[PDB]
């Protein structure tokens, strides 16, 4: 069987830095929460911002940016149709929903979250 990947990226909303020179860094917000795995129930979502460089950031061409290397996770399946079901189920169990896209040239399922759950 082939080995498929699942990159789980977080949606970053980047903007130019304000007045302050190094003008190739960025100011970027995103969402985050933290839950407990067996009690569940869901919790309030906090927002947060940070600074990065144009190198670590890749946008999806729509202007939603993302990291250049995200949290990958792989498996072994026959075709893409099966790894689709498997990976979608996995994302529904571990609280990931978002921009689903399948790069066949690399057997990768990039899903952009726009959120960051933690346990």
């Amino acid at each position, epitope marked *: 069987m082939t080995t498929f990947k699942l990159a789980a990226c977080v949606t970053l*909303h980047c903007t*130019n830095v*304000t007045i302050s020179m190094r003008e190739e860094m960025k*100011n970027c*917000s995103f969402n985050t929460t933290t839950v407990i795995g067996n009690s569940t129930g869901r919790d309030k979502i906090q*927002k947060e*911002y940070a600074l990065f460089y144009k190198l670590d950031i890749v946008p999806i061409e729509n202007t939603g940016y993302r990291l250049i290397n995200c949290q990958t996770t792989t498996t072994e399946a026959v075709d893409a149709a099966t790894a689709a079901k498997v990976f979608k189920q996995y994302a529904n169990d571990n609280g990931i929903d978002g921009e689903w896209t399948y790069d066949d040239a690399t057997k990768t399922f990039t899903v952009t979250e726009g959120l960051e759950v933690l346990f």
Partner: antibody
């Protein structure tokens, strides 16, 4: 769906005091900037005061030192205590839900929610 | 402090024809993110104000495409391509660069000609 209801407006002697209220129904406004804007004879608009999520307050110079704004997140309400009132303070007072405090550089969608006003 | 000047104070337009209103700020409203913090609001008779344009040129939710905003820096214009009877009312611009401090323009009265 948020709904704002202002109350407390009434006739008061010059030099007296009065307490205005903004009650929020349908959502929490705890992390939002809240604004007080007045209007004379249903015509013209003047921003008067504002309070942030963290309790930071802002006033126009004409009312500085005489008006004090507060909020109660447990009651999901905002309050305006006014003292040593003058005829120049007559008018209708609207309470307006603003953006989330401090995030306007990334997320600004305008002033969406207005109250009914109190006279 | 900062001042917002609207012009004209009032205008009457024949239905179907365009209207143009001008809001001028004493100081530039452009921020480092390259968006202009200038809004347009409408107040119809007997109702509270309701947002029309946010961040200079972006139509608010529910607003039809007949309404358009343009301009930059210290000069902004609100244009209604085709006026309908329902557009009568008062129009106010608002600066938000000093958020949480705000400043409204004097307002413009939009009447309908018949």
């Amino acid at each position: 769906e948020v709904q704002l209801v202002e109350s407390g407006g009434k006739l008061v002697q010059p030099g007296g005091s009065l307490r205005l209220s903004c009650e929020a129904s349908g959502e929490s406004v705890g992390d939002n900037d809240m604004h007080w804007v007045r209007q004379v004879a249903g015509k013209g608009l003047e921003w008067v005061s504002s309070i942030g999520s963290s309790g930071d307050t802002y006033y126009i110079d004409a009312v500085k030192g005489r008006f004090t704004v507060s909020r109660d997140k447990g009651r999901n309400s905002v309050y305006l205590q006014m003292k040593t009132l003058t005829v120049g303070d007559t008018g209708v007072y609207f309470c307006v839900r603003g953006p989330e405090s401090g995030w306007f550089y990334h997320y600004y969608w305008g002033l969406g929610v207005w109250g009914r006003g109190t006279t | 402090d900062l001042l917002m000047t609207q012009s004209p104070h009032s205008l009457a337009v024949t239905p179907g024809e365009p209207a143009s209103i001008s809001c001028r700020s004493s100081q530039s409203l452009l921020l480092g993110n390259g968006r202009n913090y200038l809004d347009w609001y409408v107040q119809k008779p007997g109702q509270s104000p309701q947002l029309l344009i946010y961040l200079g040129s972006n139509r608010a939710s529910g607003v039809p495409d007949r309404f358009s905003g343009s301009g930059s820096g210290t000069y902004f214009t609100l244009k209604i391509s085709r006026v309908e009877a329902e557009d009568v009312g008062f129009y106010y611009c608002m600066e938000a660069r000093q958020t949480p401090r705000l400043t409204f323009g004097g307002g413009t009265k939009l009447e309908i000609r018949r």
